[PDB]
Design a binder for this molecule. Structure first.
Ligand SMILES: NC(=O)c1ccc[n+]([C@@H]2O[C@H](COP(=O)([O-])OP(=O)(O)OC[C@H]3O[C@@H](n4cnc5c(N)ncnc54)[C@H](OP(=O)(O)O)[C@@H]3O)[C@@H](O)[C@H]2O)c1
Ligand SMILES: NC(=O)c1ccc[n+]([C@@H]2O[C@H](COP(=O)([O-])OP(=O)(O)OC[C@H]3O[C@@H](n4cnc5c(N)ncnc54)[C@H](OP(=O)(O)O)[C@@H]3O)[C@@H](O)[C@H]2O)c1
Ligand SMILES: CC(C)=CCC/C(C)=C/C(=O)O
Ligand SMILES: CC(C)=CCC/C(C)=C/C(=O)O
Lengths: 366, 366
């Protein structure tokens, strides 16, 4: 059979991630802008079974290693768009920078039809980094894309600088996407809040305990926002294909606000267990501490429910929930994207439930 | 010349109001859905000069008087859509009810091509009434259209009940629109926040004083939302013409959030004066009290700047600003409208400035 024709050819760097996994789905839909798409999906681990069941050409590669990346990506002469949706899982500026440089150095000399590089960062651009030593004054919100860089060693700054330099030199377009908190389904993410809260809820249910909210008062009652992984995918694809979005920094959220108070009630209902909400006068407790000895319990759950086998620390990031539940005042604006013609949105309450439903369909959670 | 053809014929009840004045503009644009529109505009006062310069057939009528309303509206046999965007200016349930009943009793028997009645209420549906005696527990937010009625004598309840009964009996469709705080330009409104704050700012400037924020701490820092009058008009016209919107209760806001803190800075810049923002530890002061003796000052301003002559209490509602500046937790959801296909929005910061610009173009403010 003659070689298959594609209109566009994506390199998704971080294909097992919370957005990369969505891109692997969304890019292959028949009506997706820029389609038909061929998808190369890059990650460090062996292709998981769930991803092997998708029409994605998986490339196992440690992108922090330059010679390996050259060897693995330089043969991919047909790439048209790069979606960089990866990070090393620490805030180390140079390791993260090296990963992104390696992608560009390996692809740009070899992909003569390369058009665009999508760089995914996030709303930490506006408020700072997670490293405990960093005592920094964030910007006030709503966050908009005209806010200047904070005086902090945020690896996002280095990634942008590389993006601008390398696209500029090579007559490529660029986009920087700054998603809010992601609502997604990947069990291989280092920061999946829905999966994390679903695992907590599952363990509570397993142990005949209530779904006890461990967070701060402020994070219970404040306005919060998030972004569905599929909407991030759609926003990145929009910037990759639509001339109006090119060479722009762009926030990405669902377009609404919610409260954790309301999400919590929904979570309890979804698992058919009692909730204990925020109790007046109580201080936040560490969910990471509450769950520190639960690995064997999770193993037992996986076995009893015949789930996709996951290690507790890989499917859940309890430390990340702890940060979410002592955060407030982090709302980001979608006006710039809307004014440029991107009218994609989600109902965040419905998005949260859709992620639960999807994780159950995939057998990641009971 | 042969009688002019129109596709649709609007009765706008409250044509001098903050939304009615926008409808008088929007309905007459060439690309407005349902057009070409003929517009009958009803209000109690004599047609102001600014409205006489619009292609609107003005009908001076006190709609609280049944015989007068019959006499004035029963000849209008060609009405296709009613936009009820009026209230008496008190919370008296029966006077407000009487006004709306009178419209329907006068039009329904006489307009054989009548299709739809749009009823404008508002987000007070979710939190209660302004009357000082009423000590009531509001719903929590974000406000959605599935929230049940509060146990309060809100005239909105009576207006809805009349709408349902009379449309139901007569095979007409209905829509209830619940706008957030309106950003608009009418100088004849009983509740125009932008005009009110512009008048304050103008007086501050006239007296070489700073723009001193008089509100509460909470209302300075909280998330707030609003709706541009033109977007309310567009939302009402959408419900009047689009089958998907028919027989629905629908919120209407700009689709974003803002803070008064940020609006205040913008207001000061627009008037080229210094601002004093919220001062930590200060209690809210009454802007109504601050402005109680300023009528002659406003007269002098009107004369010195050659403005459209307005009485201070008619262009500004300082009591209404006082309520805005002790409110929080009033965000409403636009998901229902979006899910039904209405994707109209405004950038609220830009909307606020556009209202200032428009009021200056009309010579209502300097
Ligand atoms: N998650 C959120 O809620 C969120 C919100 C806003 C912004 N963001 C930002 O979005 C960006 C991407 O993060 P994410 O959360 O989408 O990531 P994630 O879900 O944790 O996924 C990371 C991906 O990168 C891959 N990866 C990591 N190190 C690699 C290496 N050395 N070589 C090759 N692949 C490697 C991972 O595969 P392996 O496991 O095989 O290494 C995985 O596919 C980050 O800047 C993050 O801060 C995230
Ligand atoms: N303003 C806001 O920010 C806001 C926000 C959300 C919801 N709403 C709601 O929207 C609804 C309409 O209020 P609005 O603020 O748009 O009104 P508005 O700007 O004060 O305008 C009221 C209109 O009704 C007319 N009117 C009053 N009494 C009348 C009578 N007896 N006969 C005939 N016309 C009469 C007025 O004309 P005359 O002066 O000549 O009488 C004027 O045209 C109310 O339920 C209000 O609570 C308002
Ligand atoms: C409330 C929380 C936990 C926000 C952080 C979202 C992320 C992960 C942003 C980013 O990585 O830029
Ligand atoms: C923050 C304020 C002042 C909200 C009231 C908006 C209005 C006027 C609602 C309604 O009339 O339903």
């Amino acid at each position: 059979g003659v070689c298959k024709s594609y209109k566009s050819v994506a390199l998704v760097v971080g294909v097992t991630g919370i957005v990369g996994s969505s891109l692997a789905e969304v890019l292959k839909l028949p009506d997706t802008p820029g389609g038909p798409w061929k998808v190369y999906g890059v990650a460090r681990r062996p292709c998981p079974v769930w991803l092997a069941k998708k029409p994605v050409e998986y490339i196992q590669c440690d992108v922090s290693n330059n010679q390996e990346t050259i060897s693995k990506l330089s043969p991919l002469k047909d790439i048209t768009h790069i979606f960089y949706v990866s990070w090393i899982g620490s805030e180390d500026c140079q390791t993260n920078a090296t990963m992104f440089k390696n992608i560009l150095n390996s692809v740009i000399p070899n992909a003569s039809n390369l058009q665009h590089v999508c760089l995914q960062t996030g709303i930490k651009h506006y408020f700072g980094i997670f490293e405990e030593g960093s005592k920094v004054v964030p910007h006030d919100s709503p966050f908009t894309e005209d806010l200047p860089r904070l005086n902090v060693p945020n690896f996002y700054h280095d990634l942008e600088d590389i993006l601008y330099e390398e696209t500029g030199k090579n007559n490529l377009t660029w986009s920087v996407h700054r998603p809010a908190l992601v609502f997604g389904f990947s069990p291989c993410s280092m920061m999946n809040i829905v999966s994390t809260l679903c695992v907590y809820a599952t363990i509570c249910k397993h142990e005949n305990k209530a779904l006890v909210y461990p967070g701060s008062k402020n994070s219970w009652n404040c306005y919060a926002d998030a972004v569905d992984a599929d909407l991030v995918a759609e926003h990145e694809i929009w910037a990759a294909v639509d001339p109006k979005a090119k060479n722009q920094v762009l926030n990405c959220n669902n377009g609404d606000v919610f409260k954790w108070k309301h999400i919590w009630k929904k979570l309890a209902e979804e698992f058919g267990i009692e909730m204990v909400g925020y109790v007046e006068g109580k201080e936040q407790v560490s969910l990471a501490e509450l769950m520190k000895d639960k690995d064997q319990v999770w193993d037992e759950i996986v076995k009893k429910n015949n789930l996709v086998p996951t290690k507790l620390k890989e499917i859940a990031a309890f430390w990340f929930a702890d940060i979410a539940f002592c955060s407030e005042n982090l709302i980001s604006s979608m006006n710039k994207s809307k004014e440029l013609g991107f009218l994609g949105f989600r109902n965040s309450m419905k998005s949260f439930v859709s992620c639960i439903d999807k994780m159950r369909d995939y057998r990641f959670i009971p």
